[PDB]
Amino acid sequence: KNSVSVDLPGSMKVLVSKSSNADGKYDLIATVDALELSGTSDKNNGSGVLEGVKADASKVKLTISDDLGQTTLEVFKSDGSTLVSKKVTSKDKSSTFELFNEKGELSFKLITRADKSSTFELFNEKGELSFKLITRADKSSTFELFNEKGELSFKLITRADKSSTFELFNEKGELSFKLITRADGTRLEYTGIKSDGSGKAKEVLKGYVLEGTLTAEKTTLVVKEGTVTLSKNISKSGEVSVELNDTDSSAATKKTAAWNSGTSTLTITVNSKKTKDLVFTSSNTITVQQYDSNGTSLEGSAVEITKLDEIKNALK
Amino acid sequence: KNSVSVDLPGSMKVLVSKSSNADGKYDLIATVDALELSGTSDKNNGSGVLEGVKADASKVKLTISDDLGQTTLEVFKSDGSTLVSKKVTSKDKSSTFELFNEKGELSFKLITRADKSSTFELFNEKGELSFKLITRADKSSTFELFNEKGELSFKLITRADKSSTFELFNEKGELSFKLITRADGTRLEYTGIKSDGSGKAKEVLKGYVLEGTLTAEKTTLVVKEGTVTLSKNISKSGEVSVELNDTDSSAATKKTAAWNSGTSTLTITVNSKKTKDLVFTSSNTITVQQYDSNGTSLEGSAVEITKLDEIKNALK
Numbered sequence: 001k002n003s004v005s006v007d008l009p010g011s012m013k014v015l016v017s018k019s020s021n022a023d024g025k026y027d028l029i030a031t032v033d034a035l036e037l038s039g040t041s042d043k044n045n046g047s048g049v050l051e052g053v054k055a056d057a058s059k060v061k062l063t064i065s066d067d068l069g070q071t072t073l074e075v076f077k078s079d080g081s082t083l084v085s086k087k088v089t090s091k092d093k094s095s096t097f098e099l100f101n102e103k104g105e106l107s108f109k110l111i112t113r114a115d116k117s118s119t120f121e122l123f124n125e126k127g128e129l130s131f132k133l134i135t136r137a138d139k140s141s142t143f144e145l146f147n148e149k150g151e152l153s154f155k156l157i158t159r160a161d162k163s164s165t166f167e168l169f170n171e172k173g174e175l176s177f178k179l180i181t182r183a184d185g186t187r188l189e190y191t192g193i194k195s196d197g198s199g200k201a202k203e204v205l206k207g208y209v210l211e212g213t214l215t216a217e218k219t220t221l222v223v224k225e226g227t228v229t230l231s232k233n234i235s236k237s238g239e240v241s242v243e244l245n246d247t248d249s250s251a252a253t254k255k256t257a258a259w260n261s262g263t264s265t266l267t268i269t270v271n272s273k274k275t276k277d278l279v280f281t282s283s284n285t286i287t288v289q290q291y292d293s294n295g296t297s298l299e300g301s302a303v304e305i306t307k308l309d310e311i312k313n314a315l316k
Numbered sequence: 317k318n319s320v321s322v323d324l325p326g327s328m329k330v331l332v333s334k335s336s337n338a339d340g341k342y343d344l345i346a347t348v349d350a351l352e353l354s355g356t357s358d359k360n361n362g363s364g365v366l367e368g369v370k371a372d373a374s375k376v377k378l379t380i381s382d383d384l385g386q387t388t389l390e391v392f393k394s395d396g397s398t399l400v401s402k403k404v405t406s407k408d409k410s411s412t413f414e415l416f417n418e419k420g421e422l423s424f425k426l427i428t429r430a431d432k433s434s435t436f437e438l439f440n441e442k443g444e445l446s447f448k449l450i451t452r453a454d455k456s457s458t459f460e461l462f463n464e465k466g467e468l469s470f471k472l473i474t475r476a477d478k479s480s481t482f483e484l485f486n487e488k489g490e491l492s493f494k495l496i497t498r499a500d501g502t503r504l505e506y507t508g509i510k511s512d513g514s515g516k517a518k519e520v521l522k523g524y525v526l527e528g529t530l531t532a533e534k535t536t537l538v539v540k541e542g543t544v545t546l547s548k549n550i551s552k553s554g555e556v557s558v559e560l561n562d563t564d565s566s567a568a569t570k571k572t573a574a575w576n577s578g579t580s581t582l583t584i585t586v587n588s589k590k591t592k593d594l595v596f597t598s599s600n601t602i603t604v605q606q607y608d609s610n611g612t613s614l615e616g617s618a619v620e621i622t623k624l625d626e627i628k629n630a631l632k
Contacts, residue, residue: 033518033525034624055527056516084507102492102508107484122470125463125487130470145447147440148464154438154446168423171441176418191400192418200372202349209349211371223350308350 003027006046008064009071010089014046032060032073058084077104113137149173186284188234190214203232205284208308223308225315228255232280240280242266244315255315268314269295276314277302288314318345322362324380325387326405330362346378348389353378374400393420429453440464463489475499502600504550506530519548521600523622539624541631544571546582548596556596558582571631585611592630593618604630 003017017027025040028050037060041048050062057078064071069091075084082104088096095112109121120133128150134142141158151173157165163183170176175197178190186205193199199214203221210232212221217236222229227247234240244257244266251271258267266278273295279287279302287302288310305311319334333343337356344355344366357364359382366378373394380387385407391400398420405411413426421443428434436449448460454476461470467489473481482495494506502521509515513532518525526537526548535550543563550556560573560582567587574583582594589611595603595618604626605618621627 031524031624033520034527099493101486107493124469131461153440170417177415177423204349208347211350308347 004046006068008046008068009091010073010087010093010095012071014050014064016041016044016046018044030062032062035060037062182284184284188219190219207306208311210308223311223315225312228315230311230315240264242278242280244268278314286311322384324362324384325407326389326403326409326411328378328387330366330380332357332360332362334360348376348378351376465489498600500600504535506535519550521602524624524627526624539627539631541628544631546594546627546631556580558594558596560584594630602627 001017003015003019005013005015007013012030015029019026021027021040023040025042026044026048028037028039028041028046028048030037030050032052035052035054037050037052039048039050039062043066045068047064047066047068050064052060054060059076059078059080061074061076062071063074071087071089073085073087075086076082077084083098083100085100086098092114093112094114095110097110097112099107101107105127106123108123109119111119111121115137117137118133118135120135121129122131124130129146131146132142132144134144139160141156143156143158144152145154147153152167152169153173154169155165155167157167161183162181164181166179166181167175168177172195174193174195176191176193178188178193180188182188186203189202189204191200191202193214197214197216201212201214201219201221203210210221210223212219212232219234221232221234224230229245231243231245232240233242239261241261242257242259244255246255248254253270255275256269258269259265260267264280264282266280267274268276268278274291275295276291277289277298279289281287286305288305289298289302290300291297292299305314318331320332322330322332324330328346328348331345335342337343339356341356341358342360342364344353344357344362344364346353346366348368351368351370353366353368353376355364355366355378361382362384363380363382365380368376370376375392375394375396377390377392378387379390387403387405389401389403391402392398393400399414399416401416402414403411408430409428410430411428413428415423415425417423422439424439425437426434427437431453433453434449434451436451437445438447440446444466445462447462448458450458450460452458456476457474459470459472460468463469463485468483468485469489470485471481471483477499479499480497482497483491484493486492488511490511491509492507494504494509496504498504502519505518505520506515507518509530513530515530516527517530517535517537518527519535519537526539528535528537528547530536533552535548537548537550539546545561547559547561548556549558555577557577558573558575560571562571564570569586571591572585574585575581576583580596580598582596583590584592584594590607591611592607593603593605593614595605597603601620603618603620605614605616607613608615621630
């Protein structure tokens with residue numbers, strides 16, 4: 001009737017009486033949704049057990065630890081045993097919530113972190129895990145889906161800059177198809193992936209697309225023109241490196257190339273003179289600039305390429 | 317060899333040869349991803365069929381309708397029968413896309429409407445719906461998860477203003493649990509929903525919660541103090557209306573109340589004078605203001621209630 005209001009983990013509040021009762025203990029009052037829960041503690045700091053019974057004989061039990069460092073809120077059906085919901089909170093939430101179905105079986109679990117990381121686990125009518133939503137502080141995401149065989153059937157990975165990774169899984173739960181949408185809407189598509197992770201690959205750029213294969217730790221993309229093969233390689237890391245071979249054997253026309261990962265530039269040489277620099281830009285575009293008749297300095301401006309034809313023209 | 321470019325549905329380009337080929341027909345060129353497609357048409361406008369073979373013998377077929385109003389893009393495996401992918405675009409995107417597994421069965425289907433809108437659909441083992449994502453033009457997204465019988469298992473709706481509806485379904489795919497989160501963070505939840513819509517309902521406001529019942533047409537939330545019941549009804553749509561009954565028989569003390577929906581104000585009367593205005597606001601708060609001793613005008617300011625007890629003091 002006169003006493004203090006302490007705060008509790010979860011932004012809940014408890015009023016403790018500052019004067020004992022018959023048994024030397026202290027009265028607790030707290031309002032869960034619309035019920036006024038009450039209890040008795042030896043302690044006088046707001047810790048203890050509070051219980052209440054709903055208009056529909058539904059039991060509510062609220063436990064606060066000695067050091068006010070944890071709260072458990074349990075709701076039971078009218079038989080005081082099979083539960084409706086369970087919420088556990090420390091600091092600074094740090095949280096775990098559980099909703100059960102009308103049957104007392106678990107329907108979903110939400111684990112919420114201090115930084116505000118979610119892991120959402122949802123459970124199906126058979127008691128298995130159907131899907132999972134992971135969210136980390138920066139809002140980047142993982143949506144995982146499962147099937148009868150207790151394996152992945154689909155996964156979407158989002159990053160706050162839009163960029164995503166889209167995956168589909170085969171009969172045995174092995175990856176068979178992957179689509180990586182970049183920042184700028186450029187895409188890498190992987191198809192027919194095998195148990196050993198080999199497959200077909202395809203890079204969709206602005207106005208043209210490059211094709212090739214998937215292996216071990218790399219993707220190899222290839223453009224052919226007469227006797228020349230230009231290769232773009234993307235490693236496990238996402239390391240881009242470029243190479244060129246020419247089967248033509250006459251030192252007058254044979255192209256040879258040098259790659260410089262520092263500047264992301266492939267330099268083509270013919271007849272001991274530099275001819276072109278191909279630049280692989282951080283905007284997932286290629287540019288092409290020619291050198292002088294000396295092959296010592298670059299002339300004009302770098303030219304942004306539009307279509308596979310122009311890539312082939314620089315290889316001619 | 318080549319002479320005149322034409323633009324096509326689904327951001328493509330065809331090179332039609334001005335003047336006939338070797339037989340009155342016209343030669344056509346288009347580049348689908350990394351492949352040169354070639355064809356011959358009667359018409360010289362950019363219409364016709366273009367085929368080609370990938371390096372892995374997969375076959376590509378581009379069909380452009382005679383008026384340039386439909387394109388059809390298809391990829392087969394070697395064998396030219398079992399499809400890899402099928403895109404059909406029109407005026408003006410307006411497009412459906414389809415992807416098939418290694419067996420030629422359908423894996424996903426993306427339909428994108430003219431107004432940038434889109435339904436996405438994912439399939440399982442016996443080619444039936446696992447999930448659907450429907451995104452309307454104004455961003456509003458809808459996620460639908462189906463159980464292994466193709467009844468609903470989970471549904472999530474996010475409106476343009478971040479307000480949402482979260483729904484869970486039972487073994488018969490009837491709704492059992494509904495969570496409406498409003499734009500302001502307040503919530504309406506409904507549990508144990510039966511096959512006729514009835515259930516328990518809660519409204520989580522800032523500081524307190526009101527409890528009561530759901531019915532085929534309406535929510536009814538109920539606070540009692542002594543002989544008096546105050547009822548908040550939220551409708552089929554979402555119209556709030558409030559009513560008050562007092563079982564008290566003495567005219568000296570019995571409350572009666574007038575609802576005024578245009579102002580969202582409940583006015584309580586006792587002994588033929590007005591006493592209080594409960595005002596239900598568009599911020600989902602309640603406020604109380606007393607009348608002067610005449611019961612003819614309002615004294616002081618309106619006070620915002622922060623907990624249930626207060627509503628209940630108001631009702632004494």
